[PDB]
Amino acid sequence: CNKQNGVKNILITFTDCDTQEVIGPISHEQPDDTLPTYKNCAWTNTALTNGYVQRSASNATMTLPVVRDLRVPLAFYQGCAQVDVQVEKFDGTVMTLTEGAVVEPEESDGRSVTMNIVASEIDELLPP
Amino acid sequence: CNKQNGVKNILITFTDCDTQEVIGPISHEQPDDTLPTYKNCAWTNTALTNGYVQRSASNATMTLPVVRDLRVPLAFYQGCAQVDVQVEKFDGTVMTLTEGAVVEPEESDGRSVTMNIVASEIDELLPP
Amino acid sequence: CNKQNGVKNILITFTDCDTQEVIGPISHEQPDDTLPTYKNCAWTNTALTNGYVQRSASNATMTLPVVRDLRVPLAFYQGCAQVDVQVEKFDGTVMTLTEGAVVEPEESDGRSVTMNIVASEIDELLPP
Amino acid sequence: CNKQNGVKNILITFTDCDTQEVIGPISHEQPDDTLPTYKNCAWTNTALTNGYVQRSASNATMTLPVVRDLRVPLAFYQGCAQVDVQVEKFDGTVMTLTEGAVVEPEESDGRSVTMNIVASEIDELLPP
């Protein structure tokens, strides 16, 4: 309603990169109140001395917790399947990401996973 | 019934790597509200630069807290016997792990152990 | 007008999630003048700064006190069975809750229980 | 119908946990009008998000006030003696409990104690 912050839609598409089979795009639901976090600029900076800075190349990062869908195996969330993700917030913004790769897999219990997606670039759609 | 996140059955089968004796499959009970946690993907990932990733080989991990059964010696839980574990959740999922090995044992008090099991691969069943 | 507030009918259907047996729908009687309390919006809000708000996901809750029926076991009210409840006020309003689950059971003496039911969504009928 | 609420008989059996000597079953008398409380389900629930719920293991509890019997030491009520209790109401219900353990002792005055018994499971006998 032009104010309320939060996530509204989450779409995920799995492609297992051995058999080359695609699943989705399947929707998902947030497991708690926390929201996904982002980092779009693929150029991290490092503080030199006297006002300068070293500009190196890095990755577009994204941190996303979701409830595991009981028709997709857990391995596809643990990093054995390339993911294509899309998040849409209430305020109209959308963040799309293609050819993602789950890095640094974290131990999960089977119903709520936290994926650390790394991709070359994330796209916005700044609400009109 | 559907929508109940929790464990229902935990089967463990001990095999001594010294005398080749077998014990089990014995049922166990959760000591608290924490659930066993899982990781199926046997390939860890590392964040390289510019969207790439270094896919290396790794193991399938499992974290399982259980109440020690007063008939099986404590040593069998502290990493002195090969274990075959099998869990079932309430929503139908059942995860099987064979010929695992308890790695990095932790101190215990004699009534509730926390096993960090490592194995080659874990299979899921994905309730219909 | 606004016909006098109060409950007229309470229907409850018990379903055991172990033997898959069904009991009901059995009617019940209010033990006192307190009325069952409801909350339909499945999204809580949290107060941010400057008029904003963080809209996250949540449940639909229900508070219902009823006199135990001397044919249904007491455990079925303390959260050993999935409940399907239906209330109808005097002014025509009827609220339905399906496949709910009793959360955080409280001590009861054996003749008047107070169930804190949680469910995905409650439907309202809004008398004509 | 539903004959008057209230308790009729209370039986208690004490077994010292050191010398394994048994005393009882002795009867007792309510000190006031209040009644014992119960919780049978050995699985508490916790409110997750979006209607789901986490079903963990827990203990069946029972809170019961009685007048101290002047032939049993007060220590046997304060949690120094394993107890087996049975209650029978006017309407025909009976609640039995075996291998109970008085937990969280509360300071008493020597003539009226309130025992918080915890047991693995409490059994009913819903009246005819």
Next chain:
Amino acid sequence: LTYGNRVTLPEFAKYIVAPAFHEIEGRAIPVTGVDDDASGTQATKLPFVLVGLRQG
């Protein structure tokens, strides 16, 4: 007995009062009010017991 969870006066007077004291020959009289009449309720020979509802 009627009223499975209750006992109406007559039943009180004939089942609780009567099998008690044998010096009243079953003269446990159920009355409407205990003071409904003092000129009539003082003729039954001594001793005797009345039973009557005060207020519901």
Next chain:
Amino acid sequence: MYFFSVDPRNGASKSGDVCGSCCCESISARPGEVNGVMVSYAAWSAPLRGHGLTNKTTFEIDGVSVTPPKVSNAFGRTKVGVVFEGTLSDLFPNPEGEQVEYEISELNGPSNGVVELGANGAFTYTPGALFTGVDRFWFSINGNIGEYVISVDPTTSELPQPPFTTPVYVPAARRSVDPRTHVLKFVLGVSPAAIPGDVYRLTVRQVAIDCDGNEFVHISCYDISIGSCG
């Protein structure tokens, strides 16, 4: 008994016009039944403050799915008191005479006489003594049902002709209209010769009247579905 409430012909509609309407109300019928139908014009004639309805209703039976019958019908004649003989084999034009089983179902037998079926498509109808009129009976050749009418004169000359009752019909004069409550009653009789699965359409034209004697016409339709076991 069927009870229908007519449309009001005023502004909005009624009865599932949500996504339109089959445009005809439905009437399930079973071959042989004779039921009663009531139509309430209270929704349409009450706002027309006047003298309600009149006894000027008119009906129309039209078949949208008939499945023409296999066995044809026949007509017989005889004098009073004298026994009638007849055949039942020339009424079934067939591609084969495989196992033709002439059968007279007792549920729809004669009304004022008795029938003795022969061995091969013959029958003897003995009309009741001291009786003269029309009498029918429904035969069943190899499942296919037809009727035979043997109307009997009192040996004067003859009765002219019975009208060979249709599969579905509305009797001539059994209708009525109550101007006090705006209800029209009429009976619906369906012959036992109706084929399950057929669909007919009955249209009703009913006229009301204002306080001065003028007319307000209204037209409705109903689809009669002939289903066995119903």
Next chain:
Amino acid sequence: MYFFSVDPRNGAVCGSCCCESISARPGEVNGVMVSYAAWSAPLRGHGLTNKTTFEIDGVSVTPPKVSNAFGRTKVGVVFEGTLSDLFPNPEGEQVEYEISELNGPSNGVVELGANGAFTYTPGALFTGVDRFWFSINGNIGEYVISVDPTTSELPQPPFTTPVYVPAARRSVDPRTHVLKFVLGVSPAAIPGDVYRLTVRQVAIDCDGNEFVHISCYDISIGSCG
């Protein structure tokens, strides 16, 4: 006593086609009540009439093994008969006969001989019809005897059908719209058989016209209750 309710014909247990269900044990004679109250009460009139019509059809019959036989003896005179030419005993089998005492004669006594012979002594001073039910090696049949009052003869009654409805035992209650009738099951009815009874009841309006209604019930001849 069976109790059924009729559909009030509004298009408002279909089973297989429409017809209802009635279990039945061989030999019993039960009663059925059907309430037309739902169908005839809105048609305010003079209730039902006593013009019901019943019809029995078998959709599963299991043609009988043994056969029946007649008899036309006289009054007071003893009758002799055989029971060997009834069962065709196709495959070589013992012809062991039996006369069940539950379904014996009504005004006489039989004397089962050693080989399918029986001697029927009718009751003295009695003229009429009598039946009994034999069981030739498990399969049940009936034998009917007509004792004649020594003048000339007596007519031939019809061999009773497995499932039947008595001739005149039906009734209608116009004040409550209830039809009462009787269901008779022959002891020769083979378990597993299924018959169909169809009824055509006529109600009447205040002017003397008619309203027809047709229904069925499927009678399942089941053994052991």
Next chain:
Amino acid sequence: NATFRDASSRRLAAATGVALAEFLQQFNGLAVFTKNTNIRTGIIGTNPRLMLGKIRKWAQDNVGTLFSEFDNINEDIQLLTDFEVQPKCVGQPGIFHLNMRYRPPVRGARINVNMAPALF
């Protein structure tokens, strides 16, 4: 009448029909009070309003998968008892009328493209 155009719509409509048919059968027996609308205490029973509530709840779960959105739920799903509609002379307990509003889930279709090239 766009609704009955795709075969998908027809198959999904048959699916909803058979699903509702196999679902309603838990209202057999039951006992449905319709005069005092006050079920007693200790007797399995239901009231027409309660039944409508149940039906609505049901139709509010299969939405998106079988139905699509149910614009005005207050009107798309209606349950009228025999006595309600018919002025009470020809009324008989047991008869009910349910009417819903099928709306096939909207699917994808043509995507008109108007790419217009230019330089720089």
Next chain:
Amino acid sequence: NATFRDASSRRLAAATGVALAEFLQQFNGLAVFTKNTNIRTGIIGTNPRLMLGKIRKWAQDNV
């Protein structure tokens, strides 16, 4: 009928008989109020209903 088919079933029945016997042994030398069950304070007593209760408890435990 397949209850007492396997010898194991028979042996188990024996093991349960002896256990049930040693259990019931506790119900010796005590009262059994069976008309006005209101077991007085400070007396070792029971009534048929409490017996049935304890029996069902033991049974449901050994399941």
Next chain:
Amino acid sequence: EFSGEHGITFEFVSLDISTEGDVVYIEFRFRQNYEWCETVREADTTIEAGRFSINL
């Protein structure tokens, strides 16, 4: 004894005695709690089964 026989209990409230001439009045005042049961407990409106359906 009666309460033990049927499970019905009363409350004692007060005891007053008072004499007059050659008679002593001993006055107990008891109070009895219960719940009143709906008696109507009649037959149900109908018996459900077969409904109807128009998923136009």
